[PDB]
Structures are given as structure tokens and as C-alpha cells.
Amino acid sequence: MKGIIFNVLEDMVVAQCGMSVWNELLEKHAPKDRVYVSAKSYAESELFSIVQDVAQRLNMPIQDVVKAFGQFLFNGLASRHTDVVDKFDDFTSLVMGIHDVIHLEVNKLYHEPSLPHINGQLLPNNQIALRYSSPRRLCFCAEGLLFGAAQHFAAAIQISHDTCMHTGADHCMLIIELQNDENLYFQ
């Protein structure tokens, strides 16, 4: 898990809970004097432990917290990698380019990142079938990231998530409906 994910998580926790809470989280779930260098890899368990702690503190379902983080995370990534996101002029283009363009770039930007396998298929009625697979099973982070991407393009979406690794499948199917964006008028 790359430090950049931890850095954006810090921004979120500091904004919601305060720096005092982040320092508690860091002291408890990470070794002494831990500093997350953006490009460096760290144990994903450190991230999960922190996020689980946050969920418990807020009395929220863990997957709702991960989804919220995902949405916050897209802007964190877009602002740190503006050149990557500026490759796309709309939401649908970006989603279809997650695997072959965005995460391909991430492999050039970072040393041996741990990334999901994603494949998007354009459907009728302005829908996208996004197939997600990963041993980390962060499909709800993916959901959040998609809502973040929609927000980035001033678009509105809905997601159906009825095939899921957490309900026993070896992949998740995220069915994305584009309800509105700047090029969508009546239909």
C-alpha cells in the first residue's frame, strides 16, 4: 500500500476528527516515528487497522467508511496526479481508462504498486459494467472513487453492486448508471 494512500487518509482524518486523533491512530497502528513517503510501499494492514479504528470511533459500518474515503481519495489522487486525470474530458472516458491508462501510468510513476484488476464495458442507456478483482477486496473503495470521479466531472451516478467478492464471488460487478453530466440533456 503506497504512502500516498496514507497521506490522503491523513488529510481526511485530520479534517474530520483532528490532528490529535490522527496521531493517536498512527501511534497505535504504526511503528514508532512512522512517516508515509508518498511513493514508498507500506503494509496494507496498517491502513486497514487505522480505517477500522476510525469506523469504530464513528460507529459507522466499515464499508461505508471505506466508501467515503474512496470518494475523498479521488480528489486527493487527482490533485497529486493532475496530468493523469486531465487525460480525460468526461466521466465515462475516465472509467473506461482506469485500467489501461490510469493504473498503467501508476506502474510507471510508482515502483511495483499493488493495484486491482479492472475492466469496463460500455452498456446501453449510458451505463457501464465495471468488473473489479483484487486480493485486497477494496470494491467499496472503488465505489467511492467512482462517486469521486463523477463529482470531479460535475456528473451524477448510481452504482449497483450485486456481485461481490464479499458475498463469495471471485470478482465484483459494479453497474454504473450515468444519470447526468455536461453532455447529457434530456437523455
Binding window for Na ion (CB under 5 A); candidates: 23-31, 103-111, 113-121, 176-184: 176-184
25: left (phi over 0), alpha (psi -120 to 50) or beta: alpha
Size of the site for Na ion (CB under 5 A): 2
* Nearest-5° Cα angle at 7, 4 to 12: 130
Q: Which does 180 bind (CB under 5 to 8 A by kind): Na ion, ligand HEM, Zn ion, none?
A: Na ion
Q: What is the 3-state secondary structure (H, E, C) of 27-92?
A: HHHCCCCCCCCCCCECCHHHHHHHHHHHHHHHCCCHHHHHHHHHHHHHHHHHHHCHHHHCCCCCHH
Binding interface with Zn ion (CB under 5 A): 139, 164, 172
The three grid cell numbers given for residue 84, joined into one nine-digit string: 493523469
Q: Are 126 and 118 in contact (CB under 8 A)?
A: no
DSSP character for 124?
T
Binding flag, residue 47, ligand HEM (CB under 6 A):
no
Q: Is residue 114 a contact point for ligand HEM (CB under 6 A)?
A: yes
Residue 52: partners with Cβ closer than 8 Å, 6 or more residues away? 62
Position 180 contacts Na ion (CB under 5 A):
yes
Beta carbon of residue 121, minimum distance to ligand HEM (angstroms, whole number): 15
Q: Is residue 131 marked as binding?
A: no
Q: Which one, 57 or 103, has the nearer CB to ligand HEM?
A: 103
Query: By CB under 6 A, is residue 150 in contact with ligand HEM?
Result: no
Could you tell me which stretch among 14-22, 58-66, 73-81, 160-168 binds ligand HEM (CB under 6 A)?
A: 73-81
> Judged by CB under 6 A, does residue 96 bind ligand HEM?
no
Which residues make up each annotated binding site for heme b? 2, 103, 114, 132, 134, 136
